[model samples]
Target chain A: QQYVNINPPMPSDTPGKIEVLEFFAYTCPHCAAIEPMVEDWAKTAPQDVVLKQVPIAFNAGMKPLQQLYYTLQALERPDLHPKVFTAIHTERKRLFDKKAMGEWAASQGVDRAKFDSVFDSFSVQTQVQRASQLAEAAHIDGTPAFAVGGRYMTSPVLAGNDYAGALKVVDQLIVQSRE
Target chain B: QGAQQYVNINPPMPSDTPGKIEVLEFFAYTCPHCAAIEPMVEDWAKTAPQDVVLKQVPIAFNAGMKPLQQLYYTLQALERPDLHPKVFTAIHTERKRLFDKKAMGEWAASQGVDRAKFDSVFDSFSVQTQVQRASQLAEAAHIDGTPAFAVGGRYMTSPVLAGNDYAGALKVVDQLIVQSRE
Candidate 1:
């Protein structure tokens, strides 16, 4: 496929802001592994920082996982975020399955009744498909990738050695955004 | 390998444009590297010669990306462009997930967005679909990772080209622009 970078002309003063996009997958082991580290950065990030988390479902079957993400959104509950990782990696539960997963969500205080209705709701279904499509557009085949203001794009491998070292580059990007 | 080939589906900035360069940073908010490059990219955007053009394209590959696209565009419509970069920081730095329209609105409000209006559009269908299309396009690009860059309409570069430092990566992009003109 063709991948083109659309870097619009820079506003005179960097528009006094920048954008950071994170493309991740709920089932990906790498994303689950790095979840803690990423969380640390988000909590204490600078005021100018605008972080958006995009849950990627690479294919058709991933709709369930995608719905799980949106359902969290619908319920206004981020606390369940970690449970998903744990349910998959730690508990080895197949949370990706629809019916069983809905049951599991209720077990976790997600209100099984509502989870059932929304899990298969058209809105959640549409979002899952949309995320998969965007993953393709950004050329995302991996677990974690970052883009700044839709301009500069980078990955852990691109950052030199450690992922955290790479994040330091993100901090620099934030500073530059303020120019 | 040789010159990383990247394609831009959107039309190029008008040739009559006054900018000396146009830059696009292909990124996902979930990426740490993209987050790291945020500040430096902003700096380059600011200090860029009067002739530089910069714009952000949020990636959406498939249906799963609908929320992300809606989430991204909603921020833009809410008049919180500055918070764009912060969204990434909020996720990786603060570990907060602005996944739904309501949470996104709350987050936007926290960032100073007008509540009633922001909420009004948060659930709007138009904003939702636009974001969905953007996400689908990103998937079409077949991107394997984040923190990648394409300069002009032809050449693509990344941090690997930047010597692991965004400054160096951007320098390589500059070099690519020079080479292209040559």
Candidate 2:
């Protein structure tokens, strides 16, 4: 297998249930590239598995973009996730920081005050911090990485830099974790 | 897992050090990402599996990268591996111009290495052979970038392709080592 055991296993949110976390970044081109394939798999993933997304902030510069992901999730706007990627990567817009993202959200028809309040809210900030800690504990160093039941991690690089190959590895990992 | 996360060589290449699972780190001092991951790699080396042997291959992808490759071999010959991290620090953090042979020689002398001996080995046949061998190994592994890891000479990966995650790269290395064991 292309997966390795987490030296010190991490605790999954739902005890006795398999959890799969996709660690990614909005600014990462590779993450954007694999997003669709991941969405497809999530829809057909085994019922025993619980899939979750984690937006990683490797440094201070990535915090706002990290917050952008959580804000969308908090607003129950999972539909906007892919659009944000398109807005930045395909549109060539400079939504690189918090200010730019806020403006972009407003332009997208999101209420300015509601977006601002949530973007800077303690709830969002706390989720971001927790995500960062979880990534650190998982020893995540890059985006588009995965933790299966918080026991094994695999990615494209580990999958010989093949995006589709990486998802295949994820599928096997899900099976292994279930066992 | 399928052959996606790892490429299995049709015929596995011989490990540099026999009797141990070899893990090679393909790097260049001038690479900022390589420099960024050095600390993490250093720490991991300390606790690496007993059955595993880690080796570093300084790559010279172009003429511009030759001096750094030579620098690594020169240090190896001089038995000054302790100064390895300092070289990365000097280039990336201190902003020192150690890319040129002359600049690198002066920097080595400044670190208390004998100037004449440093120059002699820096341009010696043995160091030249090591540099050439590094290039050959990287080619054989189909390595495309710096900060890459090759396990048991069977599979290769980099942080960029590893989703830019350093720890994830190492985890893959660990898995490959286990696969090699089996």
Best by TM-score: 2
Question: Taking the tens digit of each residue's C-alpha lDDT, what string does model 2 give over A1-179?
Answer: 54555657898778867999999888778788889899999999988888899998755667888899999888777888988877778887888877788888887778878888999999999999999999878866566888898888777655553322323332333233224
On the 0 to 100 scale, the lDDT of residue A179 in model 1 is: 45
* Model 1 agreement with the true structure over A9-125: per-residue lDDT tens digits: 222223555656677767777678777888888888777777767787544466677778888887877888877887898888877787877888788777888888887788887
Off by over 4 Å in 1: A1-17, A161-179, B1-182
lDDT score of residue A94 within candidate 1: 79
DockQ-derived CAPRI band for the predicted complex in model 2: incorrect
TM accuracy, model 2: 0.57
Best-fitting candidate, scored by DockQ: 2
- For candidate 2, list the clashing residue pairs, or say none: A141-B165, A141-B166, A142-B164, A142-B165, A158-B5, A159-B4, A159-B5, A160-B5
lDDT of 2 at B182: 100
Fnat, model 2, is 0.02
